[PDB]
Design a protein around this ligand. Structure first.
Ligand SMILES: O=C(NCc1ccc(CN2CCCC2)cc1)N1CCN(C(=O)c2cccs2)CC1
Length: 143
């Protein structure tokens, strides 16, 4: 008599623009990648940390945000595939979800890049504890 499914939403995104002039290092672009909730949700209730796995070419390429904003700001010269791990305040499975984020840059004279990726997470029969956190964050029951 106690089955329940709770949906929460995540937004992954990034912005990238051509620097007026390259940096010293010949970095041509500024970019920013993030994880956030939709308007008026606090994903920090169920998200323990977000880990952004930058290209090997970056120093300390494992970037952790343990609280909002969940984001990395950098300059560089090339797009790459970025693993993003979102770790949950969950005692049981699933403990985290792993995205493969396409961090692409604007070439030539293309406008700046401003992309959003909307992810719907479905938790089947979460524990009492974690269920609270999902709801506190503005998660929704699906019966
Ligand atoms: O833009 C960068 N690298 C991105 C990259 C490099 C090479 C490749 C290989 N791609 C294969 C197809 C074309 C390029 C992917 C991504 N970085 C890495 C180098 N870099 C830096 O060394 C630093 C920044 C701040 C402190 S040190 C920052 C800029």
């Amino acid at each position: 008599d106690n089955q329940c499914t709770v949906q929460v939403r995540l937004e992954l995104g990034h912005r990238a623009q051509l620097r007026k002039k390259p940096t010293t290092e010949g970095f041509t672009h500024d970019w920013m990648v993030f994880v956030r909730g939709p308007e008026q949700c606090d994903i920090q209730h169920f998200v323990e940390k977000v880990v952004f796995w930058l290209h090997d070419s970056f120093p300390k390429p494992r970037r952790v945000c343990k609280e909002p904003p969940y984001k990395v700001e950098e300059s560089g010269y090339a797009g790459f595939i970025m693993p993003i791990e979102v770790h949950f305040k969950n005692k049981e499975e699933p403990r985290k979800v792993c995205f493969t984020y396409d961090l692409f840059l604007n070439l030539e004279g293309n406008p700046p890049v401003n992309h959003l990726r909307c992810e719907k997470l479905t938790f089947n029969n979460p524990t009492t504890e974690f269920r609270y956190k999902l709801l506190r964050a503005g998660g929704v029951m699906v019966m």
